[PDB]
């Protein structure tokens, strides 16, 4: 009931003994109580505020309703006086330090009883939606529900599943190894999201460390330093064989910090790729290396529209998913698997999943979210969600479509394996 479901969230909050814990109680803490190197402390180092906090103060008081753990992130949601409701964000860096912390009003997501309730949530004017979910089988897929599953969308981060097929491919030829060494450059250093770049030149890390981070973490950094040992062309090569339809649509194979560079750097620079071939951007790229210009505040103008983004189907990505689970069981150390299911993205069920693998990607005017999800039985089953639009408010900050994921995973009974 709902007194019982605020009180076990306060409890649990007050209870949780993890990095996300200590944040959340920290944060709520500047919100119900009555000193700026406190506040540097709990931050990244890089990290106006006391007037965001007296903001944020003067719309409560707050009850605690709902809490919603997951690793690096987490979700707070708060009851202010008059039934208004709000969501406290926080994003943590690998020791537990805040990235991000915002406060805004609630995203509000029924419980989904059929797939037509997930398509008139979800539905936005001005927003190109599509919603794919697919039973694995040996006899190809089974199809349980399919928007626009043939339109290539821009996808962000989800582009890092292909990076890692192609680091896999290299791997079982030999060509690059777990325990070999990269290093962390000034021109390697990329964007959050991530926390790779915020350690200093020269840092070396296995791959198998990187791959990690630029899988679970969506690590940019770690994504970038992962292209640059592949090459291009190794990663571009490879995409034919790790399922995508029309590998024309991501050539040349960006890395986050060409997107992020050319995106939202020179316009000029801009407008030449807008207007070259394939040999002409890829010129234009060679040129454009080097240490980023490109800040976070940059950003915000869509670009995607311009090929600046990584573009599939719904059809691509759950071709990639199903690769990655047979890369992963030919891969008898386990290392594979790790990586794939470090971060679910959600609090998973384990008693009902065995393995869930999944991904998100975000630009302005871009969501998505995918997972592959395996129950104990080996019954696989693929969930796609994209978003695009040429205003990134109308998407927002993601918390929407993931939550439609977690309510049609929540739902499985009736929505996947009914």
């Known amino acids: 009931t709902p007194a019982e479901a605020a009180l076990a969230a306060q409890t649990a909050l007050a209870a949780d003994d993890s990095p996300m814990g200590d944040a959340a109680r920290w944060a709520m803490g500047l919100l119900t109580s009555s000193r700026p190197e406190d506040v540097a402390a709990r931050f990244i180092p890089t990290f106006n505020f006391a007037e965001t906090v007296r903001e944020w103060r003067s719309k409560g008081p707050f009850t605690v309703r709902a809490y919603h753990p997951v690793a690096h992130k987490g979700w707070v949601v708060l009851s202010a006086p008059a039934g208004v409701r709000y969501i406290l964000s926080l994003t943590l860096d690998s020791s537990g330090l805040i990235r991000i912390l915002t406060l805004k009003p609630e995203t509000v997501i029924p419980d989904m009883v059929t797939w037509n309730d997930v398509e008139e949530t979800l539905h936005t004017p001005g927003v190109q939606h599509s919603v794919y979910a697919v039973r694995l089988t040996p006899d ?166 311009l090929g600046i983004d990584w573009h599939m189907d719904a059809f691509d990505v759950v071709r990639v998913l199903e690769g990655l689970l047979q890369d992963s069981g030919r891969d008898t150390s386990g290392t594979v698997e790790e990586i794939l299911t470090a971060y679910p993205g959600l609090l998973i069920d384990e008693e009902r999943w065995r393995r869930v693998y999944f991904k998100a990607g975000s630009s302005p005017g871009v969501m998505m979210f995918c997972w592959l999800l395996q129950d104990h039985a080996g019954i696989s089953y693929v969930l796609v969600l994209r978003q695009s639009a040429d205003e990134q408010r109308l998407i927002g900050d993601g918390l929407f479509l993931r939550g439609i994921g977690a309510k049609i995973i929540e739902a499985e009974a009736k929505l996947l394996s009914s």
Do not use: C
Not at 205 to 214: F, G, L, Q
Not at 235 to 257: K, Y
Not at 278 to 298: P, Q, Y
């Open 140 to 305: 190809g897929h089974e199809v349980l529900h399919a928007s626009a599953p043939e339109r290539p969308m821009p996808t962000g981060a989800a582009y890092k599943l292909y990076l890692m097929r192609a680091l896999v491919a290299e791997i079982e030829k030999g060509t690059v190894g777990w325990d070999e060494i990269l290093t962390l450059t000034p021109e390697l250093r990329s964007l959050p999201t991530g926390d790779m770049q915020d350690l200093p030149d020269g840092t070396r890390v296995t791959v198998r460390e990187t791959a990690h981070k630029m899988i679970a973490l969506s690590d940019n950094t770690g994504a970038d330093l992962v292209a640059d040992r592949l090459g291009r062309e190794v990663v571009e090569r490879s995409l034919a064989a790790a399922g995508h339809h029309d590998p024309s649509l991501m050539r040349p194979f960006l890395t986050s910090h060409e997107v992020f560079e050319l995106g939202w750097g020179d316009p000029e620079r801009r407008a030449e790729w807008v207007r070259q071939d394939e040999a002409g951007r890829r010129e234009l790229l060679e040129k454009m290396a080097g240490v980023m210009t490109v800040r976070g505040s940059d950003l915000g103008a869509t670009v995607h529209q």
